[PDB]
Amino acid sequence: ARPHVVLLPSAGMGHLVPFARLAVALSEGHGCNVSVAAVQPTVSSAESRLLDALFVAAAPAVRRLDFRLAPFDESEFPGADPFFLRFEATRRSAPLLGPLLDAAEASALVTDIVLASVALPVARERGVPCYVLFTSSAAMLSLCAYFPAYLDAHAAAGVGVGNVDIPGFRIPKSSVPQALHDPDHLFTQQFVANGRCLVACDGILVNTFDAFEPDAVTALRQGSITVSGGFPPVFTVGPMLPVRFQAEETADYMRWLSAQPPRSVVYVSFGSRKAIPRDQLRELAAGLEASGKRFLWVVKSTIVDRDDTADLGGLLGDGFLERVQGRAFVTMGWVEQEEILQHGSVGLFISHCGWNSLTEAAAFGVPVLAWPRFGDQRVNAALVARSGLGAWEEGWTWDGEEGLTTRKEVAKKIKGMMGYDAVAEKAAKVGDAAAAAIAKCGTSYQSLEEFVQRCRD
Numbered sequence: 001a002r003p004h005v006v007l008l009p010s011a012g013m014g015h016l017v018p019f020a021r022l023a024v025a026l027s028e029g030h031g032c033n034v035s036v037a038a039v040q041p042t043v044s045s046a047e048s049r050l051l052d053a054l055f056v057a058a059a060p061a062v063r064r065l066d067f068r069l070a071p072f073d074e075s076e077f078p079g080a081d082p083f084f085l086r087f088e089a090t091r092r093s094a095p096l097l098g099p100l101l102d103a104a105e106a107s108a109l110v111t112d113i114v115l116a117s118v119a120l121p122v123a124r125e126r127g128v129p130c131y132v133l134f135t136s137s138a139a140m141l142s143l144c145a146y147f148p149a150y151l152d153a154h155a156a157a158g159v160g161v162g163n164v165d166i167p168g169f170r171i172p173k174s175s176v177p178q179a180l181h182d183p184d185h186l187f188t189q190q191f192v193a194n195g196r197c198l199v200a201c202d203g204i205l206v207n208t209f210d211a212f213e214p215d216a217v218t219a220l221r222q223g224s225i226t227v228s229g230g231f232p233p234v235f236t237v238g239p240m241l242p243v244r245f246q247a248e249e250t251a252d253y254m255r256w257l258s259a260q261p262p263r264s265v266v267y268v269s270f271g272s273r274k275a276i277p278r279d280q281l282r283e284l285a286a287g288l289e290a291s292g293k294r295f296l297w298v299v300k301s302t303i304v305d306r307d308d309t310a311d312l313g314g315l316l317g318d319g320f321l322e323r324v325q326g327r328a329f330v331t332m333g334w335v336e337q338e339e340i341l342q343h344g345s346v347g348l349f350i351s352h353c354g355w356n357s358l359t360e361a362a363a364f365g366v367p368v369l370a371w372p373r374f375g376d377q378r379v380n381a382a383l384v385a386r387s388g389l390g391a392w393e394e395g396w397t398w399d400g401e402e403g404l405t406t407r408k409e410v411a412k413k414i415k416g417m418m419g420y421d422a423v424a425e426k427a428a429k430v431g432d433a434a435a436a437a438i439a440k441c442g443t444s445y446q447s448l449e450e451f452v453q454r455c456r457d
């Protein structure tokens with residue numbers, strides 16, 4: 001009999017992608033029936049394309065479960081981004097999960113970490129085991145678990161964050177996610193509320209492998225990060241592989257990559273939606289041109305779902321596009337990043353250190369030039385450097401900090417990463433370890449097997 005696992009992803013590709021990969025790992029790898037609770041329509045076209053692809057490619061084990069949201073008035077948060085508005089509407093619809101869980105006849109609920117505080121009580125009331133999928137690194141999970149206790153210790157009767165010493169490394173004050181400094185920030189309220197409820201759930205799934213973050217996983221497993229010493233089991237199931245889809249047309253960028261020599265291309269992406277200020281963007285563009293390397297650069301518009309091919313001329317100038325025409329592919333369109341990373345022609349990935357991108361780089365042994373921008377990115381950047389996955393210049397500024405990282409710094413960094421043999425070798429070693437972990441008898445496979453075991457019981 002196939003256990004029925006219900007998945008509850010939050011909005012955005014950062015959340016949906018891991019959920020989609022987990023759905024396949026459970027169904028194809030471990031014989032589960034998986035239902036993805038999905039709200040229609042999606043906030044963005046990429047999520048909609050991903051769901052449509054997932055339901056066809058993973059049929060019939062992976063299925064759509066329609067989730068109807070309670071009416072939400074967007075006037076409460078004027079000017080708020082559509083992803084946050086979808087998240088808040090979902091959070092308020094948490095009581096509607098109870099009828100959905102009973103209709104689903106769920107063996108277990110796997111809730112997104114951002115919805116955990118509201119999902120867990122509903123699951124608890126219905127007697128359904130509730131597990132949490134954490135979308136970032138084990139280091140971020142340890143910070144998330146520890147942060148409420150850290151705040152409580154500093155709560156004198158009658159603000160911001162300093163160095164956070166997680167029991168069992170130090171997150172320096174400049175690496176703390178910027179929103180956490182403001183206690184009233186919406187990100188901060190959810191980060192604390194979700195962190196507080198982690199100890200009360202059945203288990204936590206993390207898209208990482210024990211060899212990648214040995215200290216963070218050990219501390220979580222030992223319960224070092226909580227006042228009581230109690231913590232639920234931690235399943236290291238990463239890096240989850242990309243879903244196998246069938247494309248019917250090869251994309252131009254893939255064709256362009258094929259025309260380039262092995263490991264000659266620097267791929268540049270700052271994630272699913274990060275958009276950068278014109279001054280930083282100019283330095284980045286100039287740095288790339290100055291490097292002399294072939295590059296594939298994906299630029300994100302500030303408007304969701306806008307493919308602004310003409311904005312390239314407005315944003316960077318016609319001259320830059322003209323000058324780099326023979327060695328670069330620059331686009332504002334969505335690309336299938338997982339495919340690009342598996343291509344032999346890619347030698348370097350300049351990334352924002354979003355966890356999903358990092359897992360993809362780790363899985364394929366691609367060196368990463370870490371350029372963290374906000375949130376968990378600096379914490380993730382440190383992992384890239386320590387692991388040997390890539391290099392991080394700590395001095396480069398991030399959002400809210402003064403000072404432009406120049407074209408010269410970018411060019412030197414790119415040239416060095418491409419130039420030095422050790423960088424590719426170290427990244428390859430990370431790939432080898434990740435491959436060992438996800439294989440049969442590997443720690444990640446073992447974790448998934450144990451998790452499904454509990455679902456069968």
Ligand SMILES: O=c1ccn([C@@H]2O[C@H](COP(=O)(O)OP(=O)(O)O)[C@@H](O)[C@H]2O)c(=O)[nH]1
Pocket residue numbers: 013014015017269270271272273274298333334335336337338353354355356357358360
């Ligand atoms: O043009 C793009 C931009 C992003 N991604 C994918 O979207 C995800 C980005 O998630 P991540 O955690 O890295 O960062 P975020 O988008 O949440 O900032 C990854 O799975 C990428 O492969 C993509 O496929 N194409």
